[PDB]
Every structure is written in C-alpha cells, then in structure tokens.
C-alpha cells in the first residue's frame, strides 16, 4: 500500500502493483521518498483519481482482453480538456498503456479529418498567410509523401 | 493552471499520427502544427525526384529518419526510357551529408547512383545507415558497395535487386562476412555477380543471428548447403540456381531448408527438383515461380500442396488449369501476378494461356484477393463482370491482353470494365492494356466515371477517338499519375484532358497524333508544369509533371524541354 | 516486355 | 482453443495461452492462418507433444517456483537426440523459456570437462591438424583470457 | 528429420557457457566449436599486452564487446620499473578502430595512453563506448579526457584511478555535467585534480539517475553537500577531503549522506569527524580507512559499529587491538588488506603493529575471509597454523614482514607455511615476503609441494641456497606467474627452475647471483620465450614471458633483450 | 614503497 | 632557466591551444618553430592534418611531450617538408618508421636536424636514401650513428654544407 | 485563523492579521483557496517558519519602534544561504517590510568592501578579461561618479 499526494493536498490510498504502473512512481521507490508519500504536485486530484481508476482496472488483467477495449472505450467518453489533462498526466507519471492511450485517443480524433474539420473540432484559428498555405499544400501534393 | 488546450499536448500527440495522409492534413491546420509536423516527420517518399530541390526537402523535414526517392519513369523498366535520361542521386546525397543528419535509411528507386555518390553517403552516414536499397538503379560498381559495407558497420538491410553496376571484384561480400553482425535482409535477387563466394554468404549466415531474408543470383544451390544450415532464422529465400544433370538423378533431394522458410522461389526449378518443397509446402505463404522451369501440369501439382499460399508470382504457363487449382486450394490468396512467358514458339505448352475460364474461376475461388495483375491471352466481358462481383477489396488490378491471338471472343469490353469498376470500389491502382478494337469511347468514359478512388492508371490501346479521352477526362476525381501508350488521341486532346483532370500531377504518353508544330501541347502550359519530349528516335514520348523547382538542369540531348514560342 | 524477364527468357533458351 | 498440425498430419487440441508461449504461433494469429489450424511441419509429432507438455506446465505458474526447477530437471531426463530436437523446436517456435533451461542443461554438460572429455561425452571427432591445435592451445594459455 | 546432433544446437548453447576456462576447453573440441567460440566470445583479458599482436587478437575474436589489457609488470606499482618501459596502448587502439567494430568496453591497466590514442578511440567508438578504464596508466592529459567525453556521449563507466596525466583545465568534467545522462560509475579516486569544479560534479549527480559509485580527489567534503543530496542512488563514495579547523568544532556533523551509501572511505577523516558515520554504520559493507587520520583506539570504536562489514582496507595502525575488535563484531568479513603505514617515526602509535596476536585472533573470528593481505611487524609459526586451520576458502593470501623489528619471535617459518598451504586448499594467489632468516630450503620446497591451486606467487626473502629454488621447482603444478625479489639464487638456478615448472608463463626476478657473462640465463632459451633484462642502473631485473609475437619492437635504452651468443 | 601511499604519506606531513 | 634543470617539467608551455588556432584561423602558415614547449602526439597529428602539404618547416626546439607517432604523423601528411628539426627535444621512441617514411617519399628536404637526441631505432640506410633523393639537402645533424655507417650517406649528400653529430668510435 | 501549507506537506496554524502581511496570501482570500489551506509549495518549511516569526512580531506593533530595530537586527544574525532564501520568500509572498530587511542585510555585506573582498565573501570567480577590468576601473575613476 502506497500514498500518492495530489497537487492540492489530497492523500490517495493505492495498492502496490497499481502505483507501479507509473514508472515515475516506481523509479521513486529506489530513493524511496515514500516515507512521506510520493509527492506529485502536477496532477489535479480530479485527474489523479481518473489515472488510478485506469491503472486499477488494467492490473486486473491478472485474471486474464475483449472486455478491456470495452471499458477503455467507455473510459474515454470524456471531454477534451479532460482528455488532454490525462495525456499530460500519463506523460508526467510514466504509464505507457495510458499515454499510449490518451495520446492515441486524441490522434484518433484527427485521423481522417480534413484541415478545416480538424480546427473546427478543436477550435483553432487558421493563421496561415495564403502564400504559406499554398506552398504547404503544393509541397504536400506535388512533392513529398 | 488554466483550461488545458490541444496546444498544450499536440507536440506529444503528433508522434502518434502515422498515416502520411493525416500528417498531410495536420500540417495544414495552422503554423504551429505545421512546425511540429516538420520537426517530427520520420519518413518521406518523393515519387519523382525532380519535383522539388533537396534544399526544399531538408528545410521542410530536417529530421527525416527515412527517405525514398524515385527517378526515371516506370516506362524505364521496359526499355522505353534513355539510359541518360536523369535521376541522378548525387545532389540528394550531398544534401543528406549536410542537412539530414538523422537519416538512417535510404531507398533509391530507378535512379543513377555513382561510386562517388555512394562513397559520400557511406562516409557521411557511416554507422547510422541501418538500411540502403539500390532498387533498379544503375551507374555504380563494386567499389561503391565496398565503400558502404566498410563504413556502415551496422547495416541491417542492404538491397541491390535488378540494379546494373560493373563487377570488378567480390570483396564487398567478403567484407560483410568478416565484420557484419547486424544484417537482417540481404537482397541481390536479380543480379549478375560472378566474383562473389558462396563461402562468404555462408559465413554471413553464421554471424548474423537476425538474418531473416536473403535473395541471391545464380549460385548453385548445392553450394549453399552450408548457408542453409547456418541461416537458422531464415524466413525468405529467392534465387540460387537448380542445375540438374542426368548423372545425379537425385542431385538435390537432400536439401536442409531452414525450418521457418515460408517465402521462397528457387530459380530454374524443374519438375524433378520441385518435390524438395513438399515436406513443408503447408507452411509456404509466398511463392515466386517467375523464373521456374516447370510446365502447366507441374504448377497444379505444387499449387495444390500450398493451402496457405497468400502470394503467388508466376509466368502464364500457370494456364487456366493452374488458376482452377489455385481457385479452391488457396482460399487465402491476397496477391497474384501472372507475368508473360516465352511468347515466340508456342505458349511454352498447349495449356500456357490464361483466359476467361481462369479469370472467372479465380474470381469465384480467391475472394480475398487485394492485388491481381495478369497478362491474359483472351478475355470476355463476362470475366471482368465476375471480378467485379466476387472479389471486392481488390486494390490494384492490372490486365494486359497479349497480341498473340487473332480472334478475341467478344471484344468491345465497355460493359465489363464498367461492372468491374463498380464492384471493386476499393480500387486505387488500375491498368488496362488492350488492342485497338478493345474499348470504345463509351467504355473509356466508363473508366473515368466509375473510378473515384484510383490514383494511378496505365491505359493500353483504349478508345476510338478524342471524344473518348475528353469524356474520360471529366471523371477521375483522384487520378494523380496517368500512363497511356498506343492511343490515337491528338496533341490538343491530351492537352485538354490534362486541363480537366483535377488531381493529375504526372503524365507519360507514348503514341499520339503529333505535329512538328509542337504548339498544340502548349495549350496545357500552366505554371509549375514541366513538359518534356523524348523525340521519335520508338514514337515520341511526352513526360509532364508538377514541380516546385523549375526545369531540370540535367537533361540529355535526347530530351527536349518544351517552352513557350520557339 | 519487362526487363527482368527479357533477361530470363533468353538465359532460359 | 487452437489447433496445431504436426509434421506428419497430427492435429493437436491445445489451450489459448499454452499455444501463445510460442511467439511463432502468436505472430500467426495476426494474419490468422488459424482458419485451418497453425501449420508447423518441422516439428515431429512426438516432439511437439513434449513441447506442449512443457508449455502446459509453465502456464500453470498462474497459481504462483521451487517445484518448477524440479519438474524441469525431471523433464530433461531424456536422451541426447531428443534434447537436440527440443532445442531445434524451441527455436522453430519461439519459446525463450524452453531455452534458458535446455541450453543451460547442455552447457552444464560441458562445464568443467576437458576438450577430450567433451568430445567423448558427445561423440565428436577431433579434426584439428596438430599445428592448429597447437596454435589454439598457445593462444589460450599464453595470450588470451 | 534425422537424429538431432550436438552440432544442430551448439551455436545456441555456446552463448550460455560463460566461464573463460570452459570457453577455453570448448574452443578446442574441434574446428567448428573453435569457430563458434571465436565468433561469440564477448570478453577477453590479456595479462601482458606483448604476448600477442593486435592482429592476432582481432582475427581470433572479431566480435569482442569488452577488452582488458595489462602492460607494465606489477613491480611498476612500486617504482621499480622505468617509466618508458613499454605498455603502449596505441597499436591496440588502432586495431580497435579497424577490426573490433563491436567493442563497447575498454580497460587498460598499467599502460601508456597518449592523447592521440584516446582521441582515436573516442572517434572510432563514439556513442558505443559504454565504459573506459584508464587504470594506473600514464601519458595523456585533460585533452584526451575531453575528447572521449565529447565523442562518447553515452559513457556509463569512466575510470582514471591512480593514473598520471597533465591537467591543463577542467572542461572534461564540465562537458560531462552538461550533456551526460547515462553515467553509472565515475572514478578518479587517486588523482590530483585542481582545476575541476565541485559544481560540475553536483550537476552530474542531478542528471545521472543511475549514478551508483563515485570516487574523487581532494574536494572539500563541505563543497559536496549539494552533490550528496542530488546523488539519490549513490551506493559508493570514496575520496574528498575532511579538513577540520579548530574554528568550527562542528564543521561537519550536518552531512546528508545518500540513504544507500554502504561502500565508503572519507580521506583524512579524523576522530572528530568519524561520528558522522555512526547514524548508518550498521549499513556499511565496505570501509576504506587507507587514507584516514585516525588512531588505533579510534579504529576499534568504528569497526565495532559495523557488524555487516565484509570489506576492510586500512593501514597497520589498526593494531592487534583493532584486529581483535574485527574478530568478533564483523563475522561476515570477506576481504581484509592491511597496508603499511608511516614506518619512520614510531609505528604511528604504540599499538600500530600487527602481530601473531592479531593474526590468530583474526583466524578464529572471521572464518569467512576469502582475501587477506597483511604487512605484519612480527610472526610466529603458530599464527600461520591457525590461518590454515580456521579460514578455509581463503583464495588470496599475502604476508609481508616489515623490516622495522630486530627480533622476530621464532623465525624459520617452514612448519607454519606448510600447514597454511595444507588447510587453505582453495588458494590461487599467494605472496610471502620475509627477511633472510625467514625460510629454509626445506620450507621453500614445502611451498612448492603444498600449493596445487596457486596460479601466482610473489616470494620475498625466502630460501638459503639454490637447493631451495630447485626443490620448489619440482612442485607448483599450476604456477603461471612467479615474482621473486631479494633472493640469493644464481642465474643457472633460476634458468633451471623455469625449465622444470610445467605452467610458468611469466617470471619477474630482482636480486640474484648475476655474472657479466650473461650466458647462464641462456640455459632456459626456449622458442617463444622472451627474456628481458633491466640492468643494475636497483639490482638487475629479469623479465621473461611467453609470446606468440616475437621480441617487442619498442624497448627503451634501459632494457636489454637477451638473445643467443652476442 | 607503494606509489599511492607514497603520495599520501607526504600529503599527510 | 629550464635549459638548466631549474624549471619543473610540468610548468607550462603547452602548444595545443596554438595548434588549434592554427587549424582554424592561420590558414596561411607554412612554418612553425616551437621553443621550450610541451608538444603532444595529438597536437602534432592535428598540425599535420591541418597544414599538410603546406607545412614547409617544423622546428621542435628543446620541446618535450611527444613520441615517434607524432613524427610519423607529420612526415606522412606533410609531404613537402623542407626543414624538420628536433634538436635537444625529449620524446618517447617507439620505432623508426618516421625516418623510413621520409626516405621513401620525401624529395624536398633541405635541412634535417636531430642533433642532440637519443634515437636507437632509426636506420642509417634510411638516412643515406634521403640523401640520395633530396637534391637540395644542405644541412643534417644527427645522433650517435657510427660515422662509418654513414659513408654511403656522405657520398650521396653532394650538396651538404653542414654536418654535426655521428659517433667516432 | 488560516492554514498555510509549506512545500513539504507541513500545515501551519497562523492568525488572521499575521498571514495578511503577505499580499500574496491576501489576494488569495478573494478567490479564497483557503478552503484547503493556502497552498504555497515554494517555501521550505524551515523558511516559512522564520517568515511567520517575523510577521508575528511586526503585527505586534499594535501596542505601538526602538525595540524593533533591535529584534530585526538580531533576527538577521543568520547565515547567507538562509538570508537569501528569506529574500526569495519575501518576494514569493509579498512582504514589503521583510524584503527591505533581507535585501538591506545582503547589501550591508557589500557596503565598504573592495571588489576582491566582495567575491571573497560570496565565493565569486572574477571573470573579467584584464582589458574589461581596466576599462571599467578607468570609467569608474576618471569619468563617472
Ligand atoms: C510504358 C508502359 C509499359 C508498357 C508495357 C507493355 O509493353 C505492356 C505492359 C508494360 C507495362 C506494365 O506495367 N505492365 C504490368 C505490369 O505490372 O507489369 C501491368 C501489367 C501486368 C499485369 C508498362
Ligand atoms: C615485485 C614486488 C614488489 C615489492 C614491494 C615491496 O617492497 C614489498 C611488497 C611489495 C610487492 C607487493 O606485491 N606487496 C603486496 C602488496 O599486495 O602490495 C603484497 C604485499 C601486501 C601485503 C611488490
């Protein structure tokens, strides 16, 4: 049992093999700061909660796939701002399943869309001068890839 | 802590977008995404080296890990393009020296590569060069090969398939044998090497634990016995020479093939040596009988033993009979290529013709087919119809009808092409090469009308008049590269169809109603559009493509660049 | 007339 | 449940996670040839049986070591020709376990023996010319190691 | 499928044979095993670089990952060998550049290494050099260090212990601080650096997460406070300088030592700073009081707090009293070395002598000792007897009796050595260095008679006449390397004993009944047997060793190579 | 007279 | 004062920052004379490669810190050396190939000077061959070569104006 | 009564008007994060202690100067590293009284010393080329001030 202290003074009681999904929390039981609980003040407590939920479930692949892509897909039914905070968080800790999952989830939103549809569904202002856009478009279609 | 934006996370996510067409879009959403794509793009392919300067490439994508350049037009693979036409790799290797400091893999395809340019590549990239592919290239010698294998000590994959170079010695192979440990794939499949030692090859196998694929020239297979025992992890082997002599009736029969070999093709293999494959035929997923000396009967008997075959390449000797066999034993077949055989003294035998019979058989049996390319001796509208009805998810279909036969069952193929294009709606590449009567202006328009996903097309002897080219031209929403030979169309019609085609960026045409005037092609002069003529020294060729670079500096004398009023 | 098989169709005969 | 077809037409009914110990049979559920059972015609049926027996037992480290080195040692009480066929088999499939134990077992036979004792207990003909033997011996004792 | 042979499996198995002595055998079973060993050998040590050419090394073992060469004779560590004697690393690094393309670790011990030769190593091996050890080398400068730390960006272990070089600047350390991430062990333990910044060392700690061991020069320990906080994973630390001033009575006392530190030695540590160790003394498994300023009383008080101590190095100040302490508190002791202290003005204090009392106490307490090396002020046959009875599995035992004392209790040590050699039958290394009366020809024959496992021996002032050498020479079945100094034996006796010794491949002798003739040593002239003399410019030295290479090209003027009739 | 302690026995005094 | 054993060997005089400056910014340098300086093999390998055929003259004058590897480096990369001097220098002599290298390829040598130096591994044959190839050889100063061994040398050095050294035994 | 959470999980019970000396803690009772105590993770707990001690005493200028310059002077009898941490802390919070005292304390160390004495008593390496040092010295003595 390990204690994780969120970025707003919020202790979290979590199991051994759950907190170890994060190689950032694992490489921190060598020089064990665990004496005062692992201080990770970059994760919102709301987010850290969601991170632990994910790790909890995946470690329960002890009893050994089909129902996971189901829980995973349902776990990602969240809003953008929260998706992004998960990515940042998976990177901050070191959860390849999750960073590889949040990042992939954002990437899945881009895949197949056109440049307009992309900045539509992310609210991004097209700041290209028309010459720049044209050059990039020509490069992409006449020359590279 | 404020609301986290995509911007706080896009540097990270971009590296999970892998598809070249999604990178394309991403790069266009705004200046920042453009920059992140620019700094993280790992692989770039240039379909035509002359399309941009190397400076432009390395400015856009400074951190390439992997590059692939093509030079000469596909036509060059059929001795239609002058040897000196172009495709010089050298400005690209100097740019790699100075500005693509991250490059670990280079694939040159149909280019001129000299010893100087590969000595430069070797020294500049050294231990970082993990893969080099000289793919149908020319212009170098064994000194060049020696140079890269002594300076690039960690090469994982080294390829020379179908390249022409001067062979002065065998020390390149020996140099690999003596120091290389990391080789995974080694490929000199379609090449004349007379001075390399099978001992060296054997010693490479002994030293390269990850050696998975090797393709080779005319080595006596018997000389490779040691090689095969040592190549424990070998999965692919093509080449060698099976030379039977009546003296040893069982010359072979005692081959130890690596236990994993599942992708193979033994050159010159006859019916008497064929059986050495039976012991593990169940395991074979790829077969290359392209250079095999076996008859239509023998094909059926081997094909029959390979239930898990997903790729087969062969000559037309396979026959209708062979296709019928393939039709129900190999249900998993994904790719089939039927090259054309010895077409002078009878079709190799009196079954070595494929026809409506085989095609329609095939269509019904191998419904998983994604790639089908076939030199056929006779077709019927019915066979095209069945292709279209049964094998959806065909991605690449090519049909050429041989000129041997006098009478072709039913010729105008309009209604067949039409149902083919309608049923195989995943089709991205399409080649259709006939004889004059083959397709009418109505059918030509059908091809343009029903091929929304086709990026490349080679059209054979299609149409009857300019009407057809023009009708065709109002379609093909996504046609990027168009190759036509043996068509009647006039200069102004070619010009006008190029204008109508929304996506066209490459045009190669041989045979067309010319005019010494020249000045009719001009009615397609756009900015950035380079038109090159290879004069009638074979009938005049037209090569035209978009380029950000302007007219190539390096044209031969046989190639005339067309510019405004002479 | 592919350039790889034109080399073979003659090394054959 | 997956079907493995031995090199003499012999179907083998085997569990999911058992056949997956072989990364050669695992990388073969991608392009799933499993439609007709996995065709592996380089393993004798007698041998394949022995391989499955080994995999069966190791997968039952679900209920979680001491008794394993026991079964393992007892599993290796076989003859040379059969030991060798197992190695070739573990390499043909891709069972790294079946390997750190069999190979170590063969190496344990070499360890401590002299060059004569080695080719004695493996029946290997010393094919060195006497100069070669001498050079190697000198290198080994005057120069290297 | 036929009966599987060992041959179908040996490539694989060979890589599980790790013991150098088993590889040795395996390489000799037949041509094939020889080849597989040749291509798979990962580490090679050469105890004397002049024993083979680098060409030979890289022909036999082209894929070495790890190399270790020794040069100058051990005697050099005691200022007995001329500086220019040999041990030039340079042909080896040129061989590594060209032919040991796999090398990732180099350890040079007692060799001459120049800046040129390390610039070449750095550039040749670059990012692949994971570990470099300049171990008691000379001949380079900080330019060479800078060169390897800028080209070898991934160095995991970098060592310079006891090397002599010219220090021009501190940039090499700064260059590590700025760009190195991978450092695991950094060792400049016994070295004068006056231009490196403790800030740079601290920043290395902050950047190298796997930094486990660091040994250092005369840095003020207070200046390393930041370093210690940052070195979270530090397990070993030696060096630094503890400089007390009466001004700050508690100068230290507030040291944060990494919580894992368990192998350490603080230089100049007095009794007043000693206590900073108490807080975690239970944890300490290795102690280096070799350069400590503490007295025999203080030793006992510290030793007493270190129950888990398995390695202790110290000067003889430890005293008999200290040995007694060590005898029952530290039962797990595996290795003990008692160097000789300031032996001019009284033994540092009136307890700073170790004797039969300490030795016999030690033999009874620390029965797990594998390595014991001791400069003793007085012995008795009884103490040798107890070593032999109690501490079996001693592997390496060295005893030198100081020359300070006039009377030694009982001197002829024959019966003691005899039971020592008989009880410690695991003994591979043995040194016994006395005074003239110390051992008789009878005892000398005992050493040769009862030491079947001894590979190396340094013999001090043993024997009375040639009778002893010759009797000795009919034993020592496994003696490879023999070092004798201060012995009476004549040239022909030396020559004759060499002839009798089955295993001898290295001989160093100082002090012997010479003869300007020279020609008596000649009676051991074998093929491949190199004899070298270092003339009496200290008494004449004889160095002789087997070599496949022939006589060294690179002798100084101070060294004369002995060849047949002048 | 070892070369490591000869350096120390003098850095001491 | 260093010429009278009054200055510590390690005092200073390291030539290396100067050779790196020569590499980068004195691109016209054809002659270098170092006097009482510390010269290493690295720094003469850099000099040789940086200046190569342009180095007409090198004088290592009472310098220390190098070896015959350095010498070899400069005589193989500086193929047009007119004047090469090592008088009173101290270095480590591992071999004689530097002199042999000159003998085999050098044509331009005008002055060659290792007057006050211990060389035990160089061959008087090589010196003779240098005399035979270097028509402009005007001055040579040498170590303890037996004068009798230089008889060939003297016949071949037609233009010799200066000779110092040798040994009359 | 307000709670201040130091940069190592250390709650501090402090009075109203004491925690208000810091305009950083005062501008933080608007959007009152006080719900979970004011999170200030940039002040060591040892330092935060010393800050509160200072504020405690100065607020007790309610009972209304002479004895203050005394406590102040005695408060500053600390070591350099600690003086500097107080400055950084006064700046992090916003205690104008405290910055004017720590900064002045460091400035008093400089006042009267020569350039050598200054870098002596702060351990600073003189990195001037001699030309630079000369120009600056000339400007200082011949021209400006
Ligand atoms: C100038 C164009 C060439 C024209 C060439 C010609 O003479 C006939 C075809 C050949 C051509 C060709 O590519 N044939 C195919 C193939 O993959 O090789 C597509 C056909 C195979 C099914 C192209
Ligand atoms: C060639 C002999 C030298 C001679 C040196 C001399 O003066 C006496 C010993 C020393 C010798 C020695 O090896 N001393 C020991 C040690 O490991 O350093 C073994 C002794 C330690 C107890 C080296």
Curated annotation (Swiss-Prot), chains A, D, H:
Upper lineage ranks? Eukaryota, Viridiplantae, Streptophyta, Embryophyta, Tracheophyta
**Assembly, per entry:** Part of a SCF E3 ubiquitin ligase complex composed of SKP1, CUL1, RBX1 (RBX1A or RBX1B) and F-box proteins.
Subcellular location(s): the record lists: Nucleus; Cytoplasm, Cytoskeleton, Spindle; Cytoplasm, Cytoskeleton, Phragmoplast
Among the GO biological process terms of this entry, one is: chromosome segregation
Question: Is Membrane a UniProt keyword of this protein?
Answer: no
Q: Which gene encodes it?
A: SKP1A
Q: What is this protein called?
A: SKP1-like protein 1A
**Stretches for region Interaction with the F-box domain of F-box proteins:** 87-145
Record key words, sorted: Auxin signaling pathway, Chromosome partition, Cytoplasm, Cytoskeleton, Developmental protein, Ethylene signaling pathway, Host-virus interaction, Nucleus, Ubl conjugation pathway
Purpose of the protein: Involved in ubiquitination and subsequent proteasomal degradation of target proteins. Together with CUL1, RBX1 and a F-box protein, it forms a SCF E3 ubiquitin ligase complex. The functional specificity of this complex depends on the type of F-box protein. In the SCF complex, it serves as an adapter that links the F-box protein to CUL1. SCF(UFO) is required for vegetative and floral organ development as well as for male gametogenesis. SCF(TIR1) is involved in auxin signaling pathway. SCF(COI1) regulates responses to jasmonates.
Q: What is its main location?
A: nucleus
UniProtKB/Swiss-Prot annotation, chains B, E:
What changing residue 78 to A does, per the record, is:
Loss of interaction with TIFY10A
Q: Is Transmembrane helix found in the keyword set?
A: no
Pathway noted in the entry: Protein modification; protein ubiquitination
Whether rRNA processing counts among this entry's keywords is no
- Gene Ontology terms, cellular component aspect? SCF ubiquitin ligase complex
Task: Summarize the impact of residue 340 to A.
Answer: Loss of interaction with TIFY10A
What changing residue 485 to A does, per the record, is:
Loss of interaction with TIFY10A
Q: What is the effect of changing residue 433 to A?
A: Loss of interaction with TIFY10A
> Which consequence is recorded for altering residue 458 to A?
Loss of interaction with TIFY10A
- The UniProt record lists the F-box domain at 5-46
Q: Which keywords does UniProt give here?
A: Jasmonic acid signaling pathway, Leucine-rich repeat, Plant defense, Repeat, Ubl conjugation pathway
The residues that hold jasmonate are: 74, 337, 375, 398, 485
Entries under InterPro entries matching the protein:
COI1_F-box, LRR_dom_sf, Transp_inhibit
Outcome of swapping residue 74 to A: Loss of interaction with TIFY10A
One GO BP annotation of this record: jasmonic acid mediated signaling pathway
Residue pairs linked by disulfide bridges in the UniProt entry: none
**Where do the LRR repeat units fall?**
47-71, 72-91, 92-109, 110-143, 144-171, 172-199, 200-225, 226-253, 254-272, 273-297, 298-321, 322-357, 358-382, 383-415, 416-445, 446-467, 468-489, 490-513
A Pfam family for this UniProt protein? Transp_inhibit
Phenotype on disruption: Mutants coi1-1 to coi1-14 are male sterile, insensitive to MeJA and coronatine, and exhibit enhanced resistance to Pseudomonas syringae atropurpurea (coronatine producing strain). Mutant coi1-16 has reduced sensitivity to jasmonate, but is male fertile when grown below 22 degrees Celsius and male sterile otherwise.
**Comment, domains:** The F-box domain is essential for the formation of SFC(COI1) complexes. The Leu-rich domain is involved in the interactions with RBCS-1B and RPD3B.
Functional description taken from the UniProt entry? Required for jasmonate-regulated plant fertility and defense processes, and for coronatine and/or other elicitors perceptions/responses. Seems to not be required for meiosis. Required for the regulation of some genes induced by wounding, but not for all. Component of SCF(COI1) E3 ubiquitin ligase complexes, which may mediate the ubiquitination and subsequent proteasomal degradation of target proteins (probably including the ribulose bisphosphate carboxylase small chain 1B RBCS-1B and the histone deacetylase HDA6).
Q: What is this protein called?
A: Coronatine-insensitive protein 1
Swiss-Prot record, chain G:
Q: Mutating residue 36 to A: what's the consequence? A: Loss of interaction with TIFY10A
Show me the LRR repeat boundaries.
Answer: 1-17, 18-35, 36-69, 70-97, 98-125, 126-151, 152-169
Question: What domain of life?
Answer: Eukaryota
Q: List the disulfide bonds.
A: none
Could you say what a knockout of this gene produces? Mutants coi1-1 to coi1-14 are male sterile, insensitive to MeJA and coronatine, and exhibit enhanced resistance to Pseudomonas syringae atropurpurea (coronatine producing strain). Mutant coi1-16 has reduced sensitivity to jasmonate, but is male fertile when grown below 22 degrees Celsius and male sterile otherwise.
Subunit and partners:
Component of SCF(COI1) E3 ubiquitin ligase complexes at least composed of ASK1 or ASK2, CUL1, RBX1A or RBX1B and COI1. Interacts with ASK1 and ASK2, but separately. Also binds to ASK11 and ASK12. Interacts with RBCS-1B and HDA6. SCF complexes interact with the COP9 signalosome (CSN). Interacts with TIFY10A.
Cite the domain annotation text.
Answer: The F-box domain is essential for the formation of SFC(COI1) complexes. The Leu-rich domain is involved in the interactions with RBCS-1B and RPD3B.
Main role? Answer: Required for jasmonate-regulated plant fertility and defense processes, and for coronatine and/or other elicitors perceptions/responses. Seems to not be required for meiosis. Required for the regulation of some genes induced by wounding, but not for all. Component of SCF(COI1) E3 ubiquitin ligase complexes, which may mediate the ubiquitination and subsequent proteasomal degradation of target proteins (probably including the ribulose bisphosphate carboxylase small chain 1B RBCS-1B and the histone deacetylase HDA6).
| Protein name stated in the entry | Coronatine-insensitive protein 1
Q: Which organism is it from?
A: Arabidopsis thaliana (Mouse-ear cress)
Q: What is the lineage of its organism?
A: Eukaryota, Viridiplantae, Streptophyta, Embryophyta, Tracheophyta
Full-protein residues shown? 86 to 254 of 592
């Amino acid at each position: 049992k390990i204690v994780l202290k969120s970025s707003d003074g919020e202790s979290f009681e979590v199991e051994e093999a759950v907190a170890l999904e994060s190689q950032t929390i694992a490489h921190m039981v060598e020089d064990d700061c665990v004496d005062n609980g692992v201080p990770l003040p970059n994760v919102t407590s709301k987010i850290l909660a969601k991170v632990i939920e994910y790790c909890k479930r995946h470690v329960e692949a002890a009893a050994s796939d089909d129902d996971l892509k189901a829980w995973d897909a349902d776990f990602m039914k969240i809003d953008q701002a929260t998706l992004f905070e998960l990515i940042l968080a998976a990177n901050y800790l070191n959860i390849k399943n999750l960073l590889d999952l949040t990042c992939q989830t954002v990437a899945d939103m881009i895949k197949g869309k056109t440049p307009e549809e992309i900045r539509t569904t992310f609210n991004i202002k097209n700041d290209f001068t028309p010459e720049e856009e044209e050059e990039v478009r020509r490069e992409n279609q006449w020359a590279f890839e | 802590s404020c609301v986290a934006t995509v911007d706080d996370v896009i540097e990270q996510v971009m590296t999970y977008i892998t598809d070249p067409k999604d990178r394309d879009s991403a790069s266009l959403v705004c200046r920042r995404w453009f920059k992140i794509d620019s700094e993280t793009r790992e692989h770039v392919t240039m379909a035509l080296c002359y399309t941009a300067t190397p400076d432009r490439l390395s400015r856009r994508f400074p951190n390439l890990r992997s590059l692939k350049l093509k030079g000469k037009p596909r036509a060059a693979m059929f001795n239609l393009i002058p040897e000196n036409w172009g495709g010089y790799v050298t400005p690209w290797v100097t740019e790699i020296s100075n500005n693509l400091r991250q490059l670990k893999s280079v694939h040159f395809r149909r280019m001129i590569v000299s010893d100087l340019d590969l000595d430069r590549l070797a020294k500049a990239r050294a231990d970082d060069l993990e893969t080099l592919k000289l793919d149908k290239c020319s212009g170098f010698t064994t000194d060049g090969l020696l140079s890269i294998v002594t300076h690039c000590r960690k090469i994982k994959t080294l390829l020379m398939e179908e390249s022409s170079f001067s062979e002065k010695d065998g020390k390149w192979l020996h140099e690999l044998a003596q120091h290389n440990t990391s080789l995974e794939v080694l490929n000199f499949y379609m090449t004349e090497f007379a001075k390399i030692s099978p001992k060296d090859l054997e010693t490479i196998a002994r030293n390269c634990r990850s050696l998975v694929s090797v393709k080779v020239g005319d080595f006596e297979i018997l000389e490779l016995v040691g090689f095969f025992k040592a190549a424990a992890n070998l999965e692919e082997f093509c080449g060698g020479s099976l030379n039977e002599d009546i003296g040893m009736p069982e010359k072979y029969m005692n081959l130890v093939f690596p236990r994993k070999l599942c992708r193979l093709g033994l050159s010159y293999m006859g019916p008497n040596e064929m059986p050495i494959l039976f012991p593990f035929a169940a395991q074979i997923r790829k077969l290359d009988l392209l250079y095999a000396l076996l008859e239509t009967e023998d094909h059926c008997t081997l094909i029959q033993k390979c239930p898990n075959l997903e790729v087969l390449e062969t000559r037309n000797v396979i026959g209708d009979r062979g296709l019928e066999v393939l039709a129900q034993y190999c249900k998993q077949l994904k790719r089939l290529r039927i090259e054309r055989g010895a077409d002078e003294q009878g079709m190799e035998d009196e079954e070595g013709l494929v026809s409506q019979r085989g095609l329609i058989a095939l269509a019904q049996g191998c419904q998983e087919l994604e790639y089908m390319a076939v030199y056929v001796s006779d077709i019927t509208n019915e066979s095209l119809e069945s292709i279209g009805t049964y094998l959806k998810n065909l991605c690449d279909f090519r049909l050429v009808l041989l000129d041997r036969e006098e009478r072709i069952t039913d010729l105008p193929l309009d209604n067949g092409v039409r149902s083919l294009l309608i049923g195989c709606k995943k089709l991205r590449r399409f080649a259709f090469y006939l004889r004059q009567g083959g397709l009418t202006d109505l059918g030509l328009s059908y091809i343009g009308q029903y091929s929304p996903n086709v990026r490349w097309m080679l059209l054979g002897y299609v149409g009857e008049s300019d009407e057809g080219l023009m009708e065709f031209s109002r379609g093909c929403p996504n046609l990027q590269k168009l190759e036509m030979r043996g068509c009647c169309f006039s200069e102004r019609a070619i010009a006008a169809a190029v204008t109508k085609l929304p996506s066209l960026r490459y045009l190669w045409v041989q045979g067309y109603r010319a005019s010494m005037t020249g000045q009719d092609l001009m009615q397609m002069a756009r900015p950035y559009w380079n038109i090159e003529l290879i004069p009638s020294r074979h009938p005049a060729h037209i090569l035209a493509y978009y380029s950000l670079a302007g007219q190539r500096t390096d044209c031969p004398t046989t190639v005339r660049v067309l510019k405004e009023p002479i | 007339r592919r350039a790889s098989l034109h080399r073979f169709l003659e090394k054959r005969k």
